[PDB]
Ligand binder design. Structure first.
Ligand SMILES: [Mg+2]
Length: 350
């Protein structure tokens, strides 16, 4: 299911004359783009009826696990879009199951239990982190779940903190995520594109590099870190009420930020030289991380909790060329306020 066909080649896109790149939206385009974005954001927001279904699934799973394997304090947690304020009604339910009972990390044992109790399309992937995928026919929800993936819970908590800092982040990130789904550039497993978490990091990194910045570098704000419930200091600043309002110095609207996001990644950002690091909040070079030797390093996005891992390693040179075309395609359409055409649903050739 290769998203970017090998026929694209690997050539770098041309450097367009800077005078031919639109510098800012016109007054009419921004006003219409602003209303079109807030109308779409209202459609993208989740509904209460589906929110209670996701909580019913969590409770149903937690009862099934504790009744089948009692005495192990098995708890079910939401993470990803389900826990960072960025999910929609059609989003999957991403679940992290925790227990001190290490035997539960054999996930096909979980797959058998859920299939035995009526779940459908039950597949286990025993893989980076083992995953059980189900489809709940009663609640009409798809669910991916892993066991003791505490890293996913922490960086979900980091994304949620970033979303809580500035009220423009949630609508901006949800609209961009919607764009990644419509263009089908959010499949790092089979399509060769970028993961949902990779895109969120690219959004945060863009917001950190604005002048003035919309978001801070939470990993570097040492004086704003709280003691977690395990007794350890949080790796990132998480004092949300004290962090709120950090981006108020930036006066750009939602419409301008969407325009600048695509403009940044279409023409401004030098993909060949720099690594995007939301951990540092500044640009790093590939050379200072020795990342000029990484295979699939055309796009370097540093994972904040493991600076030795490039989130963009799922994109080869052909996939990156197609990804760069989509970002330039998006920039040209948003520069004219064409939000609907920017989000045209991609369809795979037969
Ligand atoms: Mg403040």
């Amino acid at each position: 299911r290769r998203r970017m066909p090998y026929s694209l080649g690997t050539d770098k896109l041309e450097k367009v004359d800077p005078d031919k790149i639109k510098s800012k939206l016109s007054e009419d385009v921004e006003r219409k783009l602003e209303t079109d974005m807030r109308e779409l954001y209202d459609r993208l927001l989740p509904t209460e009826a589906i929110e209670v279904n996701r909580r019913e699934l969590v409770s149903k799973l937690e009862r099934l696990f504790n009744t089948e394997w009692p005495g192990h304090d098995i708890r079910v947690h939401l993470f990803g879009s389900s826990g960072n304020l960025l999910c929609s009604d059609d989003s999957d339910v991403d679940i992290c199951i925790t227990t001190p009972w290490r035997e539960l990390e054999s996930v096909c044992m979980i797959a058998e239990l859920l299939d035995r109790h009526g779940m459908e399309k039950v597949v286990c992937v025993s893989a980076k982190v083992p995953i059980v995928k189900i489809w709940d026919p009663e609640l009409k929800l798809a669910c991916d779940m892993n066991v003791n993936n505490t890293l996913a819970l922490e960086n979900t908590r980091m994304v949620r903190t970033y979303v809580s800092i500035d009220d423009r982040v949630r609508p901006l990130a949800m609209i961009i995520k919607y764009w990644t789904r419509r263009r089908v550039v959010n499949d790092a497993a089979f399509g060769g594109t970028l993961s949902s978490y990779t895109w969120i990091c690219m959004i945060i990194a863009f917001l950190q590099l604005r002048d003035p910045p919309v978001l801070p570098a939470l990993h570097q704000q040492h004086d704003l870190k709280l003691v977690k419930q395990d007794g350890a200091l949080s790796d990132f600043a998480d004092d949300i009420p004290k962090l709120r309002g950090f981006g108020a110095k930036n006066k750009d609207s939602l419409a301008v930020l969407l325009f600048q996001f695509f403009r940044f990644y279409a023409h401004e950002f030098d993909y060949d030289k720099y690594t995007l690091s939301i951990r540092m909040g500044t640009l790093l070079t590939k050379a200072e991380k020795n990342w000029q030797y990484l295979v699939n390093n055309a796009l370097c996005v540093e994972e904040p909790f493991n600076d030795g891992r490039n989130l963009g390693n799922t994109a080869d040179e052909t996939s990156f060329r197609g990804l760069h075309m989509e970002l330039r395609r998006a920039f040209d359409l948003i520069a004219e306020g064409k939000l609907e055409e920017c989000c045209e649903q991609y369809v795979f050739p037969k």
